[PDB]
Amino acid sequence: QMQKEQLNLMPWPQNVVVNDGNFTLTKNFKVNISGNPDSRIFGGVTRFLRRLDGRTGIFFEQGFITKLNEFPNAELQINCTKNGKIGLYEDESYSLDVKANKITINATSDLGALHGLETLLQLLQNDSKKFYFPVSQISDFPRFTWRGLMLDASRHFQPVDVVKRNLDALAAMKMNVFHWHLVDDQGWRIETKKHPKLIELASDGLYYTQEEIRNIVKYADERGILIVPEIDVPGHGSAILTAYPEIGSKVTYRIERNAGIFSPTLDPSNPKTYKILSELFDEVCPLFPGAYFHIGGDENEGKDWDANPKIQEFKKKHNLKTNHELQTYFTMQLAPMLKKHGKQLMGWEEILTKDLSKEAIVHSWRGPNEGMVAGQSLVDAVKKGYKTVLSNGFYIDLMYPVASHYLNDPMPKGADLSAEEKARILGGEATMWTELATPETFDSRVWPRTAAIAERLWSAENITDVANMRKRLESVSFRLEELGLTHIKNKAVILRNIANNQNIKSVNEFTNVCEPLKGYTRNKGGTEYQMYSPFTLFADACTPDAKDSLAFDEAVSQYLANKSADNKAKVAAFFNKWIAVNKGLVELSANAPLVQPILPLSKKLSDASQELLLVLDNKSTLKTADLKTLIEQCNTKDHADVELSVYESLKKLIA
Amino acid sequence: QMQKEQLNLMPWPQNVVVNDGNFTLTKNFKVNISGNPDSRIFGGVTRFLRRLDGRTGIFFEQGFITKLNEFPNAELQINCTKNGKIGLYEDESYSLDVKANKITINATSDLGALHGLETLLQLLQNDSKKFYFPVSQISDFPRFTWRGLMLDASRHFQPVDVVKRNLDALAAMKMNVFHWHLVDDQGWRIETKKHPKLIELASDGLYYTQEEIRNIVKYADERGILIVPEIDVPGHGSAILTAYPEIGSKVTYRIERNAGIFSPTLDPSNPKTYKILSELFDEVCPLFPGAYFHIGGDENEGKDWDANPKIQEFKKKHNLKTNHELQTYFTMQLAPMLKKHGKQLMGWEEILTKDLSKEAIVHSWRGPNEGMVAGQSLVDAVKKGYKTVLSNGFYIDLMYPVASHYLNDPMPKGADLSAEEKARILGGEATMWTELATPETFDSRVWPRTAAIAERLWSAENITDVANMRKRLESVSFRLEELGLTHIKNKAVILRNIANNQNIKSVNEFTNVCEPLKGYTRNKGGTEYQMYSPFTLFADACTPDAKDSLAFDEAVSQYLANKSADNKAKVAAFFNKWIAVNKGLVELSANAPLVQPILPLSKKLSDASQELLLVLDNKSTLKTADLKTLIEQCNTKDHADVELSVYESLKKLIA
């Protein structure tokens, strides 16, 4: 009897139907595995069972699942026809049939089966006493084969625990690529015995060991996820060149502590540049069994190359007119090195000029922030014959609203793309750059917006209803906590800190109408926060799509469409709430200096709120211009590196 | 202007004087290090600065601290005379002097300076706008040299991240020993490349690699902490004997899934037992540079030994009359293996019979729960000539109230110990056995109670005021969150699971009158929870010393002593609160099956509250016997494996 609309599935599967009846979860529940899956199925099914029991408190009979055919008559049957392989273009499909007395997952391989377990967890329903799954059939497959997250380990190092729990969350959202950005101006993160200066002098002692790398590779593979390592060259060179100044381009270098674009760049005319990289690949490539190796290539601004007559001579010698042509030549010297290791080369879009091999994968990243049209570099690459991954429009570090990411589609509008051109669009990847995210705040930035991205990368192109997505995301986000994700819980840590461990109610309520400044406006010029600055302040507790701002927006829209007393009260209750919040924050501040920065903002919201209560009763006597100004105070960006995201709805009310 | 009574220092230092004025923290703040410390001082000073900045939001100038005399006029000067060594009997003393314009830490070595940095953090004060340190002089040192936490990694495996943050917490509390219980019936946790069957067959894939162990030893050493590894033999042998059944004693074995005392025991008559153990020490001892190696020895109940005719002949051959004599013989066969690696032998008190070398350290653990007198095995061991560590009365896993641990003293009363005998009491150790703690709930069990234990092990013997200790503990527990400790934050995760992500307010308030069942009554017989059961339920969100219970108790005591209007109203406020909590839980339960187990308990409290409100106003007409039954309902242990810790005070109100 329940409506499909009540299911909180994400990604929304390709095919879904619900019918009368339920499967009831009891202490009899057991799982069986049949066919010929890869052994990764066993840990996956064990974890599934642990997670289901964590949610239900049943105390299932089974402990570790390790063999096929453990329980031929079990209530959950999982059938895999063959062994899955880690990589692109694998058959990731499955079907999930819930009947009144038995649940069946069928998949081409363990890959699909692991996906089906995630759908089955999302299907769990309950009443006041019991848990159940609705009788139903789901059949499913991904829209795109490359569905990724990039983790920047350079800006702020992200320890093994962060990486492991994020691999779990990727799996939970049916994401299958983890792109590991392991070097940038702010540090080198790969243990290297052949080139120990990179650890000694370019890491601060923060890095992944080779063994930890191998073990993370295995942890990902167990969970169906490919790792794509990145050594970004020849731009972003500050840390490499701290170790090896002799291959720099400037006619000296240090680990960079600020954010931004820097000048240190490897010298493509120096044979030593190529020898050192070749030796790096010999040591690093065997750690990563995936077929793809990302060599970066973003943001070389070219100034040291332009000034260096030796480089200018090299350009002339090779008939290379532009720095990008020189950088493609450089990249093409790396290609056979990677080929010797069995790897295909991938790079940020700047690598694409005429002589780039069509075997290279182009990582499309530039858009309006860079003066370009969103997606255009992708259109251009696939029309020229390159397989491409889209990250533009998925820059989750910039703290944009979830809808901006959810609606960003790897397949361009227009383009009159051929089918062959369409098939070169591998997928998409959210990019978590870490200038402004510590291990503590990382998850709060990645999740839950990356779950909405996961839906765009897996689900049908026409799954685009933002309100519906939001409704489903709430439970998705919640259930990620069982994997150790910190997005909700670490916020309370920060709030306790700011409030000197007084009652955090008011400061928590105030976060729910505040959002960190977006784009490149929090860390202005890159010099306001260093890579060792404290991220334990109010902006670090705030996220986009602030819960009470979204609720207030909805209340205000409903009200303005039908100005009923019930709808008006729903609005007015926010205002009374915010007046109380402000008083609570002033009280807290008497023993908490870290509340000081937000007091001007809560005062402005409280002042507006007070007047808007009179507006709603047509009892306000401020002059139009003074009412406009009062509300305008709430659009200030000057306090605590956050903004009030109720401002637009305050403006809609004042007429 | 502070008074010493307002300072939240823990352990309370040996000498504390507060004088007039404050040092004000500003953006000019810097640190300088002088003298001849061990290099561990550099990371410790860097983490200090990072932590201080996180609390204050100042954005200090210095990033990483890496050399001596970086800023010779810095506001904070740290002078160390010599290099500290990891081990026992080090001089861990320091002085900390805060003047209006300058702060100095002077210490014999970096070990004392590391401690002083923790005291300095605890001295941080603020008003509404600024942070400061009171002008004061502290000179300090520990009462005992062995101030330890034991972590059981066998019952529930505790990943690297758990171990690392707990090492930070130990340093924060000036604790200097981490005892790692790396094997038990429920799993073997040491990567062994030469005895791979222990990983393959006895670990479920859950273990620390050798490189992880070496890097945890380093992490600990950097923080002034000794690691003491334990391979527990010959009892608790289930997992060892799953890999090597041929050295068992029964005339077949599996990794144990339940809690309890089990029969599988190594065979001390079999030459292969000593061969395998000698090989294991050859592989494992090099991983742990500390001078002490724990061989366990607890709870061999001796049944397989008694039954085995070969072991009986062996006892006749060696004139060993008792199992304990035979086990001491076995233990003394290991003593030269350990000494060959430069290690001294430690074991649980069972190892002590007459022929145990007086160079063995005796770990005193038995008391009234084992039918013994608390502390007596320690008294006996030091009188006989053996150095001893007290763990009896520091069994934090059993969920006893903090005061039982805080008042437990490694120095026995009325034993007329000699000075030589006193000096054999090395110190004490909190033991976190993990039958009933996952990596998620581990910190909620350890902290903050182990912080009170830290004070017992460091501070003077006469610092015993429980109420003052509780007052100081609140901020100590809060500040541990900056080190990643999950004791507070993971509780909300559990409450969201229980509430189905509804508003957790009522369930959180109900945790504040409930405590998990104590002793050996939560997992009755060891068979109610397995090592893979779900620890995501109400008992897992509750802790001893529930805050509203303690407040209630105080309000009831004050009222019965002085039945003033105001006092009566303080008592009544709890009853009105509990009525509201029960309503909230009933509301939640409509969509949250995991609330069902607590409803009977919250209804029992609400019912008592309703009647006692009438009692307090003499509007009650219930008969004495019926009022008594009504309150007695609240002493039930049958719901959710918790108890209402307001019951005793309810009973006092109606006596």
Author numbering:
A (entry chain B), B (entry chain A): 1 to 251, 270 to 673
Provide the publication's sentences verbatim.
No culturable Bacteroidete has yet conclusively been shown to deconstruct cellulose via the actions of a PUL7, but we recently identified and characterized a chitin utilization locus (ChiUL) from the aerobic soil bacterium Flavobacterium johnsoniae. The F. johnsoniae ChiUL consists of 11 genes: two SusC/D-like pairs for oligosaccharide capture and transport, an inner membrane transporter, a two-component sensor/regulator pair, and four enzymes. Here we present the crystal structures of the FjChiB chitinase and the FjGH20 chitobiase, as well as a small-angle X-ray scattering (SAXS) envelope of the novel FjChiA_M domain.
The fourth enzyme, the FjGH20 chitobiase/N-acetylglucosaminidase, was active only on CHOs. Thus, to illuminate these features we pursued structural determination of the FjGH20 by X-ray crystallography and were able to solve the protein structure from diffraction data extending to 1.70 Å resolution. The crystallographic asymmetric unit contained two protein molecules whose interaction gives rise to a buried surface area of ~ 11%, as determined by PISA21. Analysis of the protein in solution by size exclusion chromatography was consistent with a monomer unit being the prominent species (≥ 80%) and thus the dimer observed in the crystal structure is likely not of biological relevance. Each protomer consists of three domains: a central domain (residues 145–502) composed of a (β/α)8 TIM-barrel, an N-terminal domain (residues 1–144) comprising a six-stranded β-sheet and two α-helices where the helices are sandwiched between the β-sheet and the central domain, and a C-terminal domain (residues 504–673) consisting of an eight-helix bundle with two short β-strands. Several of the active site residues shown to be important for substrate binding and catalysis in GH20 members are conserved in FjGH20, including the H-x-G-G-D-E motif where a glutamic acid (Glu317) is proposed to act as a general acid/base in the reaction. The FjGH20 substrate-binding pocket is distinct in one significant way compared to the archetypical GH20 from S. marcescens (SmGH20)20,25 in that FjGH20 lacks the extended loop that is located between β-strand 7 and α-helix 7 in SmGH20. Interestingly, a portion of a loop extending from the FjGH20 helical bundle domain wraps around, and closes off, one side of the active site cleft in the TIM barrel with a tyrosine residue (Tyr538) that projects its sidechain into a position similar to the Trp685 residue in SmGH20. The FjGH20 C-terminal helical bundle is a distinct domain amongst structurally determined GH20 family members.
